[PDB]
Ligand binder design. Structure first.
Ligand SMILES: O=c1[nH]c(=O)c2[nH]c(=O)[nH]c2[nH]1
Length: 529
């Protein structure tokens, strides 16, 4: 196929514009994913109580601190209780000589009259709206789980659909669905409906995530392919800074969700100017349209010599590739073909390790300071140089050793954190930073490597199974944190051993530097032969 890119232009005006345009969309998609930290923030809260919240109440010489103490009991947070109030105002407790033994817990009652929330940081959040607190607190992480499950199912659906119906088509309608469902989620009347809309938004997030990178890779020259995929991966790094910047300005969750959703109507509108993947079209047996896509890209690059391409030349270039594609395929053929099965197992294991570890490390970084927006920005600032380094290594060393080294570094940082006491807080901070660097670089290596390992006929099915595994790991992540009751080291041991073990397993995967992309399963067998 590459001769056609050499005629059309494998790097130039078109690829420059395309990479820029798709990277920006990935930035906004990253905001959509990370929005939970600001849309669903838990502000400090207490029960509503007469002496504090009845604005008609009579004045006294008491201070607000004393008035609060008279009404809300002290709680386990070494601060006023968040879920109880006194059944009768405790005038006996105004005396500073009084003791906690003076009142029974039967003298308290739950927040029957509702909650009061702190507005000093956020004007409103879904937590403050639907009272996802106290006995209902489990609903706040349920939303994150439902979003991640939405991405899991969306990958499962969009992979085969992308291989069957095209790259750009599914990308376009994924953009539309993201816009519509994010806008709908911003105006949800009730929590179940909010969960439904977030789920349907994630279902499309999966399609954008998958199609953008593959569509970039299938239109780019060999030497530029790692750089282009690295820029697409840096879209997320800038998306973290963008999330911090936007969430700093907009403090209402409805307005914030709407603001991060509206851009996707523009993404939908400008996606129609993109070409469909000509490589895929040829391999599907549709050269008559692939010619139009190719001369479209030639026209963008400025090549007036596009007349050199006709169906004659295209077919004479690609007939022996196309002759193999007579039979239909399925995800089942990733597991009942000799060569593809092992690549599948090890690739899926690496994707699972990435997803399983990343969302734990991203929150481990939250101990590094007291400002939530700054600590969101740092997730990107830590990631930018890590992915530049990943590009340098992946250029000079190849895919296999770079992936192995990155995942091993992540897992070894996690495991090293078990041996360092909090007295050495500087060291624990350094190791957390290195862990985030390792997983961020491993994401780049995974994205590039698992696209080269699989043929064009089934590339997106494979990438979709990888995404499924990643989101399954992300969902399992929080559950592993429950093990800490047996010992605080155990969750860290488990978080660390998976990336170490998968990084070691990556060493068994075949190298792909300086090879053509495979286009048919026969190519995967031929490579082994
Ligand atoms: O470097 C990344 N940061 C993320 O926040 C993220 N989320 C995701 O699904 N893939 C990635 N990659």
């Amino acid at each position: 196929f590459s001769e056609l890119l050499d005629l059309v232009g494998g790097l130039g005006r078109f690829q420059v514009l395309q990479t820029m345009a798709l990277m920006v969309s990935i930035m906004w998609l990253c905001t959509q994913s990370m929005l939970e930290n600001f849309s669903a923030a838990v502000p400090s809260h207490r029960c509503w109580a007469p002496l504090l919240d009845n604005s008609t109440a009579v004045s006294t010489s008491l201070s607000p601190e004393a008035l609060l103490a008279i009404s809300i009991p002290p709680g386990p947070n070494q601060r006023p209780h968040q879920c109880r109030r006194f059944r009768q105002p405790q005038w006996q407790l105004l005396d500073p000589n009084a003791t906690a033994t003076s009142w029974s817990e039967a003298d308290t009652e739950p927040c029957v009259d509702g909650w009061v929330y702190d507005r000093s940081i956020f004007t409103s959040t879904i937590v403050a709206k639907w009272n996802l607190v106290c006995d209902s607190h489990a609903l706040k992480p349920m939303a994150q789980s439902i979003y991640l499950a939405g991405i899991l199912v969306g990958a499962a659906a969009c992979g085969p659909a992308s291989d069957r119906f095209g790259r750009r088509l599914v990308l376009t309608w994924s953009y539309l669905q993201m816009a519509v469902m994010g806008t709908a989620a911003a105006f949800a009347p009730a929590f179940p409906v909010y969960c439904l809309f977030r789920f349907l938004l994630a279902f499309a997030v999966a399609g954008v995530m998958m199609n953008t990178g593959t569509l970039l890779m299938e239109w780019t020259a060999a030497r530029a392919r790692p750089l282009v995929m690295t820029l697409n991966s840096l879209g997320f790094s800038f998306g973290h800074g963008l999330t911090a910047a936007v969430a700093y300005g907009v403090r209402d969750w409805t307005l914030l969700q709407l603001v991060v959703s509206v851009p996707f109507f523009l993404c939908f509108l400008y996606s129609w100017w993109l070409p469909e993947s000509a490589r895929w079209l040829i391999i599907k047996g549709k050269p008559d349209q692939a010619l139009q896509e190719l001369r479209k890209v030639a026209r963008i690059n400025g090549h007036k010599e596009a007349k050199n391409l006709t169906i004659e030349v295209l077919m004479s270039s690609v007939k022996e590739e196309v002759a193999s594609a007579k039979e239909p395929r399925s995800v089942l053929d990733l597991f009942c073909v000799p060569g593809l099965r092992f690549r599948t197992c090890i690739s899926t294991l690496c994707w699972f390790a990435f997803g399983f570890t990343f969302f734990g490390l991203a929150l481990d970084l939250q101990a590094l300071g007291s400002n939530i927006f700054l600590l969101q920005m740092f997730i990107g600032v830590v990631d930018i140089p890590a992915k530049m380094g990943a590009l340098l290594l992946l250029s000079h060393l190849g895919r296999r050793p770079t992936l192995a080294a990155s995942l091993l570094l992540a897992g070894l940082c996690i495991l090293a954190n078990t041996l360092v006491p909090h007295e050495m807080g500087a060291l624990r901070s350094a190791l957390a930073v290195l862990g985030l660097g390792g997983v961020g670089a491993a994401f780049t290596c995974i994205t590039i490597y698992s696209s080269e390992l699989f043929p064009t006929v089934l590339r997106m099915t494979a990438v979709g199974l990888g995404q499924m595994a990643a989101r399954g790991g992300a969902i399992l992540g929080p559950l592993v944190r429950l093990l800490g009751v047996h010992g605080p080291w155990l969750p860290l041991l488990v978080y660390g051993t998976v990336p170490v073990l998968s990084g070691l397993a990556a060493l068994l995967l075949p190298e792909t530097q300086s090879l053509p992309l495979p286009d048919t399963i026969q190519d995967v067998q031929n490579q082994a032969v």
